[PDB]
Structure 1
Amino acid sequence: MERYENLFAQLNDRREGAFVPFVTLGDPGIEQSLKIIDTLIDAGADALELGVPFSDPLADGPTIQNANLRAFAAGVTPAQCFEMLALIREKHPTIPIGLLMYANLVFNNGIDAFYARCEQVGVDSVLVADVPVEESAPFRQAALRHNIAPIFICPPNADDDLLRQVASYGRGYTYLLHHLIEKLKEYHAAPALQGFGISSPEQVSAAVRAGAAGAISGSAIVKIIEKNLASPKQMLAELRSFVSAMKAASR
Structure 2
Amino acid sequence: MERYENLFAQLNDRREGAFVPFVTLGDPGIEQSLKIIDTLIDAGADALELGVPFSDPLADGPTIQNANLRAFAAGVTPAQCFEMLAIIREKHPTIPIGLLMYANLVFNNGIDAFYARCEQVGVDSVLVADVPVEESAPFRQAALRHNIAPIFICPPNADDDLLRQVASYGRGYTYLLHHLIEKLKEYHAAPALQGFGISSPEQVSAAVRAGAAGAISGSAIVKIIEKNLASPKQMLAELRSFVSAMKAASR
Q: TM-score range by the shorter chain?
A: over 0.9
Alpha-carbon distance in 2 for matches of 1:77, 1:94: 26
Q: CA shift at 1:160, angstroms?
A: 1.0
Task: Report the equivalent of 2:226.
Answer: 226
Give 3-state SS (helix, strand or coil) of 1:131's partner.
Answer: coil
Alpha-carbon distance in 1 for matches of 2:169, 2:208: 24
Gaps of 5+ in 1: none
Alpha-carbon distance in 1 for matches of 2:125, 2:201: 26
Relative to the length of structure 2, the TM-score reads 0.99
Q: Deviations over 1:102-136 (max 9, x none)?
A: 01111111100110000000000000011000000
Name the % identity: 100
Give 3-state SS (helix, strand or coil) of 2:22's partner.
Answer: strand
Q: CA shift at 1:156, angstroms?
A: 1.2
Task: Report the equivalent of 1:57.
Answer: 57
Cα RMSD for the two superposed structures? 0.6
Q: Deviations over 1:8-56 (max 9, x none)?
A: 0000111110000000000000010000000000011000000001101
Task: Report the equivalent of 2:77.
Answer: 77
Alpha-carbon distance in 2 for matches of 1:242, 1:121: 28
Give 3-state SS (helix, strand or coil) of 1:198's partner.
Answer: coil
Q: CA shift at 1:158, angstroms?
A: 1.2
Q: CA shift at 1:188, angstroms?
A: 1.2
Q: CA shift at 1:204, angstroms?
A: 0.9
Q: CA shift at 1:233, angstroms?
A: 0.7
Alpha-carbon distance in 2 for matches of 1:212, 1:98: 18
Alpha-carbon distance in 1 for matches of 2:199, 2:83: 29
Relative to the length of structure 1, the TM-score reads 0.99
Q: CA shift at 1:230, angstroms?
A: 1.1
Alpha-carbon distance in 1 for matches of 2:54, 2:177: 21
Q: CA shift at 1:2, angstroms?
A: 0.6
Task: Report the equivalent of 2:134.
Answer: 134
Alpha-carbon distance in 2 for matches of 1:178, 1:210: 6
Q: CA shift at 1:150, angstroms?
A: 0.1
Give 3-state SS (helix, strand or coil) of 1:216's partner.
Answer: strand
Q: Deviations over 1:167-225 (max 9, x none)?
A: 11111100001110010101111000000000111111111110000000000210110
Give 3-state SS (helix, strand or coil) of 2:53's partner.
Answer: coil
Alpha-carbon distance in 2 for matches of 1:161, 1:202: 31
Gaps of 5+ in 2: none
